[PDB]
Structures are given as C-alpha cells and as structure tokens.
Amino acid sequence: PRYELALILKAMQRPETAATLKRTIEALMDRGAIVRDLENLGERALPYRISAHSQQHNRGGYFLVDFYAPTAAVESMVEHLSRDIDVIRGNIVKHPLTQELKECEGIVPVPLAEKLYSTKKR
C-alpha cells in the first residue's frame, strides 16, 4: 500500500544529510518499496528534547518519503530505522491522501430527548 515515512534526522551538514537520505531510500527499495517523492520540511527545533543512540537532540531535519510497499516491508523498515544512528525518530503511517474524505452536508441539530419519563403525575 501507499505509506508516508515521517523522518527526523540528526542535524548534520549537507553531505552527511544526503548520504543518510540515500541510505534510507535505498533501504526502502531493497525491501520492495516504490518511492514516489521526497520532501524537505526544513531544519527546526524539536518540540521537546529527544534522546537517541546515546545522544541528546534539540534540532533535527524533517523529511517525508512517499512510497508504495508491500505490507510486510513496514515491519522490516521500522527495524532498519531503529539501528541508523543518524535518524532521531522515524515513523511510517498510511498515506493520508489515500483515505478519501466523505462529503459532509453540515451539522444536523439534535432535538432535546423526549419521553424519557412517563407522563404520570408525580
């Protein structure tokens, strides 16, 4: 199916960042994935401090990898990302653009619930 890899990489210089991305996309291809796109979301401060591979991180490079892969590749890819020392945090989610949003007509108002109690005189 179509997946989206949200990848936070260690803040590095351009050459080491390209080597990590190439090494990560090749890992996907070795597992049968068809990589569709690679997006750079920019280097930014992390929302909180993240400890990964005996190091503390405050900044990271945010990247996205849109790809198709067999269902069995996800479990194997998660294991690969856990061992790469240049990856702070990598998560694979089902691509949000696959899920089609149903149309919404609007807010149907809810009337006050009726006849909850018998009409006998109390």
Binding site: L41, P47, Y48, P96, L101, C104, I107
Partner: protein, 97 residues
C-alpha cells in the same frame, strides 16, 4: 378542485445546515499550525468541542492528529508552540478576566 388549497412540498425557506470551520478541509498531523489553534496556550490541553466549535467528525480528526503529531516529534505536549500564539483565535475561551 380548488386552486387555493395548500400543496405538499419540502420547506422552501429551510436554511442550509451549518458547517464547522473545518468542514471539507483535510486535517493533517503535519499541519501543526492548525492543530495548535485547538490546544490551550498555557497547558497544551486539547479543547473540547464546546470550545472549538468543531463537529464530532472534526473534533476526532483534530484530536487524533494532535496525539499523532505530539508523539511523532512535530508538536509539543505541555504547551502551545509560541510561534503560533498570534494565529487567528477560533476557540471560544477567555483566560484574562
């Protein structure tokens, strides 16, 4: 019979159903700016739908997106990112007197 009798039909004056501010829009966990508009600035607490004004479907989508973004490293948990404090105030809550 008679021309002046009422005729059966659907209400012509019926107003269109109201829609939430996010009706028809995609809620992504990567859009932290949007998600930040639905958390407390001081505590990061997700606002209930009575404050956000969202429908049930979008309150859930926003809630699930916030939780995903927080634990995936896109959004802080204990406070609203200060970068988004000057964004449009869409929630019905006032903390200053």
């Amino acid at each position: 019979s008679n021309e002046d009798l009422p005729i059966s039909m659907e209400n012509p004056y019926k107003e269109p159903l109201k829609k939430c501010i996010l009706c028809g829009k995609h809620v992504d966990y990567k859009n932290v700016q949007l998600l930040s508009q639905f958390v407390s600035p001081f505590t990061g607490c997700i606002y209930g739908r009575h404050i956000t004004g969202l429908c049930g479907k979008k309150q859930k989508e926003i809630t699930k997106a916030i939780k995903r973004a927080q634990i995936m490293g896109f959004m802080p948990v204990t406070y609203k990112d200060p970068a988004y404090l000057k964004d449009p105030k869409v929630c019905n809550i006032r903390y200053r007197e």
